[PDB]
Amino acid sequence: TLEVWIMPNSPQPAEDFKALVAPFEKAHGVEVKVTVLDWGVAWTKITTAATSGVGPDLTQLGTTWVGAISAMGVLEPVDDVLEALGGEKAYLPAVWRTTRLEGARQATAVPWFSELRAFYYRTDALKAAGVNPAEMFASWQGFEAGLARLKASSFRDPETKAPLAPLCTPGRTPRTLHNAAPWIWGAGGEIVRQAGGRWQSALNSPESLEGLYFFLSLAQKGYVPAESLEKNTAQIEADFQAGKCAVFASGPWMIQRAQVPEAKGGFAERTAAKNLGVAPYPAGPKGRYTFFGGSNLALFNFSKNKPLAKELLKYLGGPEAQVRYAQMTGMLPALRSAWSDPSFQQNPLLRTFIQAAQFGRTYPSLAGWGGVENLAVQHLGMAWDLVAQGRLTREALKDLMDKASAAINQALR
Ligand SMILES: OC[C@H]1O[C@@H](O[C@@H]2[C@@H](O)[C@H](O[C@@H]3[C@@H](O)[C@H](O)O[C@H](CO)[C@H]3O)O[C@H](CO)[C@H]2O)[C@H](O)[C@@H](O)[C@@H]1O
Numbered sequence: 192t193l194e195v196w197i198m199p200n201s202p203q204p205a206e207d208f209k210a211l212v213a214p215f216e217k218a219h220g221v222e223v224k225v226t227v228l229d230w231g232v233a234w235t236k237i238t239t240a241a242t243s244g245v246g247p248d249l250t251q252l253g254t255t256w257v258g259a260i261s262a263m264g265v266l267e268p269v270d271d272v273l274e275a276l277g278g279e280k281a282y283l284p285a286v287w288r289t290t291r292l293e294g295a296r297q298a299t300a301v302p303w304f305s306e307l308r309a310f311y312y313r314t315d316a317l318k319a320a321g322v323n324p325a326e327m328f329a330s331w332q333g334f335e336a337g338l339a340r341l342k343a344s345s346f347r348d349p350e351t352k353a354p355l356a357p358l359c360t361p362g363r364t365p366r367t368l369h370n371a372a373p374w375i376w377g378a379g380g381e382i383v384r385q386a387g388g389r390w391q392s393a394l395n396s397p398e399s400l401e402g403l404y405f406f407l408s409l410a411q412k413g414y415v416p417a418e419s420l421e422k423n424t425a426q427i428e429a430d431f432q433a434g435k436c437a438v439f440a441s442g443p444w445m446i447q448r449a450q451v452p453e454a455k456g457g458f459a460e461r462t463a464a465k466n467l468g469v470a471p472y473p474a475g476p477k478g479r480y481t482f483f484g485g486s487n488l489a490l491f492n493f494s495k496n497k498p499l500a501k502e503l504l505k506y507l508g509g510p511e512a513q514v515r516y517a518q519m520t521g522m523l524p525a526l527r528s529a530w531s532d533p534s535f536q537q538n539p540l541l542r543t544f545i546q547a548a549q550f551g552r553t554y555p556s557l558a559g560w561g562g563v564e565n566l567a568v569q570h571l572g573m574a575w576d577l578v579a580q581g582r583l584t585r586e587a588l589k590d591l592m593d594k595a596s597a598a599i600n601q602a603l604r
């Protein structure tokens with residue numbers, strides 16, 4: 192029996208995973224046993240397995256975790272699998288770079304599925320506000336003027352019978368910079384930069400502060416209600432679904448969720464699901480970026496089932512499994528060839544995610560990435576708390592990212 196650990200990638204994820212692997216099981220005369228870890232906990236259990244030598248054969252990883260787990264020395268080389276799937280050629284570079292610890296000789300993860308972030312919008316709220324989405328999502332200035340028109344609008348969701356918040360974004364200490372990265376990048380900033388053979392914080396670069404301040408100050412100007420500042424990602428998701436928000440940033444999953452009854456983990460019933468639009472991040476002063484992520488699969492080098500686990504990695508990474516699991520999850524395949532399936536191309540909301548991928552940007556794949564993102568989100572949490580007071584100024588934000596930067600630079604030395 193092979194053991195795979197996965198995250199909750201679909202409404203019934205163990206059952207979707209098991210339907211996905213049934214033909215591998217039949218062709219190999221083997222049973223796969225799946226365990227589903229919540230995203231909130233999956234980090235700790237995966238790190239405990241890596242530290243103790245007790246764990247599955249395969250584990251899903253966040254693309255941004257592959258570096259740290261690889262540096263713990265517990266991942267089996269999978270260059271052989273990536274070759275059987277078509278090698279570097281078979282992947283966007285953004286995806287290809289997630290297959291290894293930055294600068295390591297050997298690949299240690301197999302790309303499974305991709306996700307990137309774009310804005311969902313209420314077509315009804317924007318039509319009623321008189322906002323042309325092409326203009327609002329073209330530029331930072333067009334975005335700010337579309338929120339202003341959304342704030343002034345008479346519109347009220349027909350279910351809630353109240354106004355929509357123009358923008359909903361969470362102010363709770365985030366787990367990651369996924370929401371914030373597009374604004375840092377669009378200003379010409381970065382989280383860390385490589386120069387003179389070392390990585391250092393760029394979160395206190397004037398470009399980073401411009402981007403971050405522009406994002407956080409929207410909330411300060413009235414385009415994000417005080418209630419949103421008190422919420423985490425999952426709560427903002429729920430708020431868009433329940434008709435409280437006209438615009439918010441998420442992954443492609445919400446498209447397949449909008450086509451699924453409430454009773455099945457969806458909101459097809461709700462207005463928002465009937466009035467659903469997608470648009471890319473607006474271009475910033477120094478170009479157009481969005482966070483590009485997903486999950487890879489890794490094999491623990493203490494696995495007793497390496498040969499079969501490798502066949503399972505080639506099965507899951509290959510074209511048929513890639514198409515099939517992207518359809519159940521609402522994600523994108525990791526494999527470029529699999530994007531051509533009509534199931535992705537003739538879905539007009541998903542087609543927008545596909546166009547957005549041109550401007551997908553990734554984290555460098557560093558052993559210490561986790562430590563970096565954790566001090567950054569701590570300081571960014573304190574910034575959100577100043578926005579909850581009306582008291583985020585450029586000075587206070589610079590003071591917080593200087594402290595983040597000094598604590599990030601220690602971590603990297
Ligand atoms: O930072 C770790 C890791 O984060 C990954 O982002 C995930 C999101 O992909 C995930 O989205 C969930 C869907 O996957 C699932 O199907 O639906 C639920 C609700 O129905 C969604 O929340 O949410 C988690 C928790 O916030 C995020 O961590 C990145 O893609 C990966 O690149 C990164 O390494």
Ligand SMILES: [Cl-]
Nearest residue numbers: 361365370371
């Ligand atoms: Cl944020």
